[PDB]
Design a protein around this ligand. Structure first.
Ligand code: HEM
Ligand code: HEM
Ligand code: MG
Lengths: 299, 299
C-alpha cells in the first residue's frame, strides 16, 4: 500500500489547503478523488522541479459512508476543546497541496476544483508560504523542522498494518496572530511563553520554564515514549490584514493530536497554552487520508 | 538622480501592492518615505540573491502638496474610462514591492506599515505571483516580457531630464478573470480576442486580427514611435475565489498609458477591447514615483 504524496515531504515552500462540504450524492466523491490523484501524478511528471505532493482526506460522516464503516477507528468530527477556545469547523473534504512552487500548487488546486465540480461547496482556501528562516510570523521557528527524514516521519504519520495501512489522520487549524499584542511582550517573556529561546531556538529546560509554556503543553510522553506528530504548518495572510499560522499535522493516531489539544486548551490539568495571549484558533477539523490504493478502489 | 529600485528589475517572481489613503498631516509622509526607502536598501543587503526592489508613489493631490507644485505635469487623479467600463479607485499612496521571494516581500511590507504607521489607512493589499511559463491565468503570456534590458526599460519608464529626472508615472488596475467564460471559447477564437497565438505567442498580423483584439487596442504609435510602457503585472488570487491579473505599468509619460486606456475602453474610436467578455477591471489609480534623491529631499 502506497502513501499519498503530500504527507511525508519536507521543506515545502508553499501550500494550498481547501476545505469543502459535500453537495448531493456522496458517491460522486469516488470518481473525483480518483481523477484528482491521477492529476497529481500527471502534474508531477510535467513539473518535476516542483517537488509536488498532495493529499485528499475525508471527514468522518463521508468516510464512514465511503468505507462502509470499516476501519479508521479513531476518526471523528473535531469536537471543540476548552469549552469553545478551540472551535470546530468540521467539513467533509480536505485538499492539501504542497511543493516548492506556489504557481504549480495553484494549477493543481484548479484541477482539484474541476475534478470535484458541483459535488462540493468550498468553505475555505488558504495559501501558506514558508517565511524567512522558516520562522513563524511570531519570529520563533515554525515548528515543522522535526521529525526529520522519511523513515521517522513514516513511523509517526503512516498507519503500518491492517485495512488502513498507508493512511494517516490529518488535523488542520487556522490561527490568527495579533503581532501587536506579541510585540508588547519582552523577548524574554515571549521565550517563557514558548519554552525555547527566540533567535537560536535553544530548548529551555522543562524545570526552568512555566507549565503554561507551549513546549510544556505539547511535549507529552506516555510510558516514557513521546507522542509525536508530523507538522506541515505554514504562515499565511497579508501584512495589513489577517495573518498567522495555518497549523496542519499528520499522525498514525488521532490520539496524539487530541492529547496535545486537550493539554493546550485547559482540559487536562487546567492550565492553558501561554500562546493564547497573542493568537487564537478560528477553525478546526479532523480528516482521514486513505492510501492511494484505497482511493483507487473507491470505484 | 537615482531611480527607485522597484521600477526596472525584470522577471520578478512575486510582488505585493499596497494602496492607502492619507490620515492627518500630509507632512508625516516625508520622513516615512525616507525611512521606507532606507529599509529597502537594508533588506537588499540582507537578501542580495532575492533581487528585491520597491517603489513608493503618490496620488495627485498628495504629490502636488509634497512637491510644492513643481513638475509631475501629467499627474492627475485616475479618471473613469468608457463611461464606467473602467472604474476609478484613486488613493493617496502606492507601495510596490517585488523580488524573487514572496517571504522577503512580506517582511518588507511589514516594515513599510511600520514606516508610515498611523499616517495611512490601508485600502488594498494584493499579493502577486508569477504563474507557470510566465503566463496570465488565461493561458496567454502575462504581457511583461518586453521591453527587455535595462537601457530600453530606462528609456521607456524613467524621466530623463528636468526636476523629475529619475521619476516615473505608475498605473495600477486589478482585473477579475472569469475563466469559465474563457473556457467556453475555442483557442482560435481566444487568439483573435488577444491578437496573438496562445501557446507560441506569435503575433497575428493586422490583416487577420480584429481591431477589437487586445493587441490592436494597445499597440499604438505616435510620430513613428511606439507608445511603450514597462509592465510589472502579476497574476493574483485564489483558485476557488477571485483571481485575475493585477496590472501594473511604469512610464516616463502618463500619456502612453492613457492613450492605451482610451483605446481599450471605447473613447478613441468607439471600439472596445474584446477581452472584456471574460475579464473586467475593478480598481484604477495613477501615481507618481519620485527619484530617490527627490525623496531624500522631502525632509
Ligand atoms: C499558533 C500556533 C503554533 C505555533 C506558533 C507553534 C510553534 C511552535 C514552536 C516555536 C515549536 C518549537 C520549535 C520546534 O519544534 O523545535 C513548536 C513545537 C511543537 N508544537 Fe507547536 N505551535 C503552534 C501550534 C501547535 C498545535 C496546535 C499543536 C498540536 C495540536 C502543536 C504541537 C507541537 C509539538 C508536538 C511540538 C514539538 C514539541 C517537542 O517535542 O519538542 N503546536 N511549536
Ligand atoms: C486582464 C488584463 C490584461 C491581459 C490579460 C493582457 C495581456 C496581454 C498580452 C497576452 C499581451 C501580448 C504579450 C506580449 O507580446 O508581451 C499584452 C501586451 C500588451 N499589453 Fe496587455 N493585458 C491586459 C491589460 C492591459 C492594460 C490594462 C494595458 C494598458 C493600459 C495593457 C497594455 C499592453 C501593451 C502596451 C502591450 C504590448 C503590445 C505590443 O507592443 O505588442 N495591457 N497584454
Ligand atoms: Mg516628428
Amino acid at each position: 500500500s502506497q502513501v499519498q504524496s503530500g504527507i511525508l515531504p519536507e521543506h515545502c515552500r508553499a501550500a494550498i489547503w481547501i476545505e469543502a462540504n459535500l453537495k448531493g450524492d456522496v458517491n460522486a466523491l469516488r470518481e473525483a478523488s480518483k481523477i484528482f490523484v491521477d492529476n497529481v501524478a500527471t502534474f508531477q511528471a510535467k513539473f518535476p522541479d516542483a517537488k509536488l505532493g498532495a493529499v485528499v482526506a475525508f471527514g468522518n460522516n463521508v468516510w464512514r459512508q465511503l468505507s462502509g464503516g470499516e476501519g479508521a477507528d479513531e476518526l471523528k468530527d473535531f469536537p471543540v476543546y476548552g469549552k469553545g477556545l478551540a472551535p470546530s469547523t468540521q467539513y467533509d473534504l480536505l485538499i492539501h497541496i504542497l511543493s516548492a512552487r506556489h504557481e504549480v500548487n495553484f494549477s493543481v488546486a484548479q484541477a482539484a476544483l474541476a475534478a470535484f465540480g458541483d459535488a462540493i461547496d468550498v468553505k475555505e482556501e488558504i495559501h501558506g508560504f514558508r517565511w524567512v528562516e522558516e520562522r513563524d510570523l511570531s519570529g520563533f521557528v515554525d515548528g515543522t523542522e522535526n521529525p526529520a527524514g522519511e523513515e521517522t516521519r513514516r513511523e509517526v504519520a503512516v498507519i503500518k498494518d491492517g485495512v488502513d495501512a498507508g493512511g494517516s489522520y490529518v488535523f488542520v487549524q487556522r490561527w490568527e496572530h495579533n503581532l501587536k499584542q506579541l510585540n508588547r511582550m519582552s523577548v524574554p517573556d515571549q521565550e517563557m511563553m514558548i519554552g525555547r529561546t527566540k533567535d537560536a531556538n535553544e530548548e529551555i529546560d522543562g524545570d526552568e520554564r512555566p507549565v503554561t509554556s507551549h513546549l510544556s503543553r505539547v511535549d507529552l510522553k506516555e510510558d516514557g515514549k513521546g507522542l509525536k506528530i508530523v507538522a506541515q504548518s505554514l504562515p499565511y495572510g497579508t501584512a495589513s490584514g489577517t495573518h498567522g499560522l495555518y497549523f496542519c499535522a499528520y499522525c498514525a493516531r488521532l490520539y496524539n493530536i487530541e492529547q496535545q489539544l486537550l493539554s493546550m486548551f485547559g482540559d487536562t490539568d487546567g492550565k492553558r497554552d501561554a500562546m493564547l495571549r497573542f493568537t487564537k484558533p478560528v477553525t478546526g477539523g479532523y480528516y482521514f487520508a486513505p492510501s492511494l490504493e484505497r482511493i483507487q478502489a473507491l470505484g
